[PDB]
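Preliminary data (for renewal application), zinc ion complex.
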Amino acid sequence: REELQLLQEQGSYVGEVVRAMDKKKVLVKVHPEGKFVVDVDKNIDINDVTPNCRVALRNDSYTLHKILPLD
Amino acid sequence: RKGKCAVIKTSTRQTYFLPVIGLVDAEKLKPGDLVGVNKDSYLILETLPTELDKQIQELVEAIVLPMNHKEKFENLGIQPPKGVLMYGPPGTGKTLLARACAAQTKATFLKLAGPQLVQMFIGDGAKLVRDAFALAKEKAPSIIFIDELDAIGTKRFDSEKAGDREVQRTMLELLNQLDGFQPNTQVKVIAATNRVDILDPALLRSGRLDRKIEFPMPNEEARARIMQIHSRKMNVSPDVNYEELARCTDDFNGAQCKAVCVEAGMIALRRGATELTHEDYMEGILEVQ
Amino acid sequence: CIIFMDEIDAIGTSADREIQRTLMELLNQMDGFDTLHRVKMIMATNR
Amino acid sequence: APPALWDLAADKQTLQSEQPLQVARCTKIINADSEDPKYIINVKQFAKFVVDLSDQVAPTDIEEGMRVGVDRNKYQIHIPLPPDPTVTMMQVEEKPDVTYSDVGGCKEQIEKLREVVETPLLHPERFVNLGIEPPKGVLLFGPPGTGKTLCARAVANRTDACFIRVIGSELVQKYVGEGARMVRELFEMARTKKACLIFFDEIDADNEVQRTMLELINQLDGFDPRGNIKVLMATNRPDTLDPALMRPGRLDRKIEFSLPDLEGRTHIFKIHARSMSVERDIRFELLARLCPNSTGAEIRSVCTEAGMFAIRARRKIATEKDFLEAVNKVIKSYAKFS
Amino acid sequence: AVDTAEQVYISSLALLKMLKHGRAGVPMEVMGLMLGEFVDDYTVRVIDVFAMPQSGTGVSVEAVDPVFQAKMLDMLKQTGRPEMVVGWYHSHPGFGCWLSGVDINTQQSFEALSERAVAVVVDPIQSVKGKVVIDAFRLINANMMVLGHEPRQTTSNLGHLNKPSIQALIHGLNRHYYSITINYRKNELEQKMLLNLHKKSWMEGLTLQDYSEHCKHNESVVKEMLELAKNYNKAVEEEDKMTPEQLAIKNVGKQDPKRHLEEHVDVLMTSNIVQCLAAMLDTVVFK
Amino acid sequence: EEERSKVDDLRGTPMSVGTLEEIIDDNHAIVSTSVGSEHYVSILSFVDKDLLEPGCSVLLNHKVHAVIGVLMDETYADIGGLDNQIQEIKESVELPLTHPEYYEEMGIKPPKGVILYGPPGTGKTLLAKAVANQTSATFLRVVGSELIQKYLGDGPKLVRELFRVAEEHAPSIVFIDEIDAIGTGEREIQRTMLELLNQLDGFDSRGDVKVIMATNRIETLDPALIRPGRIDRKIEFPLPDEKTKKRIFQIHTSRMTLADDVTLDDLIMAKDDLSGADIKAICTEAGLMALRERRMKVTNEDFKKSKENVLYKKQEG
Amino acid sequence: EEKFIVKATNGPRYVVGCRRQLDKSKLKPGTRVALDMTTLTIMRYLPREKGCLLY
Ligand SMILES: [Zn+2]
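Predicted structure:
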C-alpha cells in the first residue's frame, strides 16, 4: 500500500544513456520528444553508469535506479 | 428513444462519439467542417462553411432572373436556363471579354480553367468540383467561367488510352451533379469553346448548356464591337476607321489583339503624338506577325 | 440502387477484350447468388 | 562566467518579469478571415484553431498568413512579431555590377527588354494615359551566350530603386512548401519597397514542382501582389510545361537571350578594363578578333582563367605577352567542347 | 509578524459535497465556495459547501458574480445558516492538482478579506477508489523569502502531511507553495446513524428475506460451485501428486511462488456456508 | 556563490534538450523540437548569443522554456614525378593569405580552390599533394563525407558547423579527401551535396578559406558540381608508371636500412599495381617483423615473407 | 461473455464491462460500439457505413 503511490506514479520510462558529462549532469537518450538531461539521484554514483547502455529512469523524478542488460 | 447520432473526426486525428445535438438546424446535418466545439464536451453549436457592350443581356439576365424573378417563376411555373455556351470560331476574345464582363457583373468571380481541374493525381477532380460547389453552392452566389471545353470533350472509340475520358469522368460527373440534382437554381456553370470540332452531344438539357449562342468570325462589325469595347475608354484619335486594321485581324484572339493594342501602346511614345493613331494598330499587327 | 447506363456506343485490337472482361464479370456477379430483387440497371446507346 | 556575472546579478528582476511574456503557442499562423471577430488559425501540428482577436492587437495589422505570437491559456493574440534565412540577406541586390557599356550584337532584343524595365518605371504617366497598360516583359531563353551580364546591366542601369532578383536554386530545395511562403514574403518585401520589381533568375533549376510553378503563375499572373511591376525569365532552359499553354496571355514577346558576334566582344573587354589595370597599349579589338565566335561567358572565362593564370605568374601588371599561352589555350582548349 | 499552527477541520458535509461535486466534476473548470465560522486564530471549521454554475471562461475572478454570491449568501443568512465564507474550492483534472498563475492571482485577490483563505482541490478522476485522501492548499507571503519559509510549530503532524509524497509537485513546486494538515471529526449521531445506515445498506429490509434464498440455493446453484470447486481441488492435487518427488529429492529452497494452502483454506471457507446455514434451515423448519 | 547556485531550479529535474532555430534582436529566441515547439522567452546568463550560431541543439525545460544555458556538441619537395603539379597546387593554394605582395595587387581572389583526383587514391598521394598547406597554416582537413553518412540525417548543419569553425579559423585550407557521397538516406546525399555546393560556392561568404576537393575519380562529380564547383583550376594525375612508385619507395628506403638486393619491380607491381599504401604497410611490418629478428638489415626472405600477408589478404577475401 | 476487449480508433486498446441496461444482442463481436470517458461504460453501438434494355 506504500507502493500504491508508485503505482499512481503512472509508471516509469526506460532511459538509455549515450554520453556522460563531466559536470555531473549526464544526458540520457529517451523516447522521441524526450532527451531529458538531468542529474542522477544522490544515492547512485555517476562513474558506474556507463554510456551506450539502457537504464531505469522515472517519468517524474528523472532519477537512475540501476543498470539494465563399417568393420 | 429515437435513433440519431453522428461520427466526429478531430483535426488531431482522434475519433470520438456524440449524437446530433445543438440548436435548430436548417442547412446543417451535411458532411462538412468548421463546426463549433467546446473544450471536452465536443458538442455542435455553430456550423460554418470552411471553403461589355455587345453582350449585356444574356449574361446579366441569366444570373439575376434565378434570384430576383422568383415571383414570375411562381406565377408561371417556369425554370430559367442555366448553361450558356459562348462558342464559335476564335477572334472574339471570349476568355478576356467574358472574364471582363464577369467582373462587370459586380458579383463574386471564381477562376476555373482547364488545367485547374485536371490534376496529376486521380480523384482530385471531384474534390475540386465539390469545392467549386463549396464556394459557389455553399458560399454566396459567385460567377465561374471555364474555357476550352471542346478539347476535353473528346469521345474516342478505342477506350484504352485517353485522358479526356477521365476529364469526361469528372466532367460527366458534374453533369451527373446537374442532371441528377434538380435544384440547380444556385450558381450555374458557364462554359465556352474556341472550336466546334468535337462538341459533347450530352449537353442538351435546361440545366446543362442550353443557350448555345453562336458567335461567328469577328468581321468588321464584330471586330468593331469587341474592339470598340477594347478601345471604349482609351484615347482614340478621330482617324481610326477600323477598316484596314479590323480587316487585318485574322485568326487573332482577344489576347493576341490585346497584345496588338499593347504594341500600339509601345511606339506611340516615340512617335511624338500623345494619342493613339490609326496606322499603329496595323503596325502592331504586322509587328506581332 | 437503380442505375441508368448511357453513352455506351463510344466504349463499345483489344477494344473488345475489356468489354468481354467487364461483361463476364457482370454475369459472374448477376447469375450466381446475387440480390437481383434489389439491383436494377438501364443501358442506353445512340446507334 | 565574466559575461554571466553582470547578467547573473541582473537576473533578480527576471522572477518578477517571468509572469508576463510567457505566451507561446508554437507561433501558429492564420489562414484567412471570413468575419472580423472569429479568425481561423492553423498550427504546424495540422490542428486548425479558431479564436477571437484580443484588444492589444489592432485588426488592421493582421495579414493573411502572418506568424504572430498567441497565448496558450487565453488563446488570444498578445503581441505580433515582424519575422531570417540566407536567402533574405543574399536576396538584396547591391554593389552595381556590369553596366550598359557592353552594348553590342543583340541590340534589338536588349532594347525591347530595356524599354520595359526602365521606361515604364521612369515614365508611368504617358504609358497609362497613352493606352491600357505599360508593357509587362519579355522572355529570355535558349542559348546562354553572355549570361549573367544583362541582368547585371539591369542592376547597374537601375533608377536607384534597386529591384529584387531570385535564383532558381531556391525553388527546388529540400523540405518543399517553403517556396509559397518565400514568394509571399518577397512579395511582401515588394509591398514594403513601394512595389519593388520582382525577378526570377535561371528558372531552369512532380507535385512538389507543380505547386511552385502553378502557384508561381498564380502569384505573378495573379493580381494580389501586383500586375505591373516586372515579369521576365532570363534562363538557359524555359521548361515550357505550364507556360507552353499559358503563353497566350499576360506574358508575350517570345525572344532569345543574345548571340555572339565578331565586333561585340570589344565592349565586354571595354568593361573588363574596369578590372585590374591592364596595359593600355594592348588593343581590345586585337584581343577580340583573335577569338572568333566567342560568347560573353567564354570571354568571361578568358578574363577569369587569364586572371588566375595572371596572378599565378607572380607579376605586377597583366600583359598578353606573358599569359598569351593562357589566352589561346583558354579559347582553344575550351573551344574544343564549347 | 506572527504565525501559529493552523489545522483545517473537515467534516462529512464538505467531503460528500466534494464527492458529488467530483462526480459532476466535468473537465471544464468549476467553481465552489466554502463557509464556516472563525472561533480563534489557529483553527478553522467548514460546515456549508455548495457548487457554482460552470462557465466557458472557467476559474477566474470575472466568473464570480457578486450579486449571485451575495444573493445566495443572503438567502443562507435568512435561513438557519449564520456562517460566513471561509474560502473557495475547485477541481484540476488531468494536469495535476497544482495551481497555475490565474489560480494564484484570483487567490491573491480573494484573500484580501479572509487572512486564512483555505483552498482545497479535489481530483477524483485519476485517483483510485481505494483512497480518497485529499490535501488543502495555502498561500505564503512574498515578503517572507528573507526569513524562514514556514515558522509553524507542532512539527509532529508533518509526518501525517508527508503521505502525499509525490516527487514532482511537493518539492517540484514547493517554492512559494506549501500545504496544511487535514483532520476529521465525527459525533455520536454520525457514528450511530451513519454506521447503522451503512450496515443496513449492506443488510436486508426485514433482515430475514435473502437468508432462505441462499439456504435453499445451496441445493440448486451452489452445487455447481461445489463441483467446480472440487474440479479445481483435483486440478491442484494432480500436481500435489508430483510434489513429494521434488520434496523427496531437494528439500532445499522454494521455487514455486504458489502456496497451495491458503487457496484450499478459502475453498473450505466457501464450503462452510452449508454448515453455517444448516442450523438456519433447522430454525426455519423448527419454528 | 548563492546567486550562482540558485538557478539550479531551472536546470534541475524539469530539463530537456531541444533545437533552437534562430535568435531575434528582441532578446527572445525561437526553439524547435521533433514536433516543432516554438517558445520565446527573454534570455538569461551562461549563454554567449554571439558565437552560438543559432540553428543548433540547445537546452530546454519542462517549464515555460526560459533559456538557462547552452550545450555545445613527407613534404612538398620529397615526392617526385609530379613536381610541376605539386608546385602548381603549392603556387595555387599557397597564393591566398600567404605571399601577399603578388596576391593583393592582382585583385582576382578566386575563392574556389583546386579539385584533386587520382586513380590510385587511398589518400596517400592526395595527402602528399595537400601536405603543402601544413607548412604555415592551421591543421584543418575534413576527410570526405564519411561523418555525414555515418550520423543521423541531420543534413548540411554539420557542414555549417565546419564552415563556422572554418570561418573562426580563416588562416586554414579546408581539404576534402575520398569523396564517397555518390560513388558509394540515399536521397539526402543529393540535397546535402547540393547544399554543400551552394554553401561551398560562396552563397553568403567571400574569399576566407580555400576548399580542395580530392577523390578517386574526377568523373564521380555530377555535372551540376562543375560550373559552381570548378571555377579556379583543375588538375590531371597520370599513371605512376614505376616513377612515382620509384620516388615513393625511394623515400621509404631513405629512412630504413636495406641494400639493393631487394627486387623493386615485382614488389611495386606485385599484385596489379600500387604506389605507397600497402608498400608502406609492408615497410611498417617490415621494420617490426625485421625487428623481431633482432637485426636492422632487411632480409630478402623476411620482406617478401611479410609481403605474403598483404598479397594473401586482399586475394583470399 | 460479460467483459470483452475493445479497440479504440486512436490505437491503444482497452477493456470494458457490461451495462445493466443493454443486453447481449449487440454485445457480440464484429459490431462497432461506443464507450464513455468515465468508467468506460457502454451507452449504445455504432453501425458501420434485374435488367432491361430500351434502345
Ligand atoms: Zn486546466
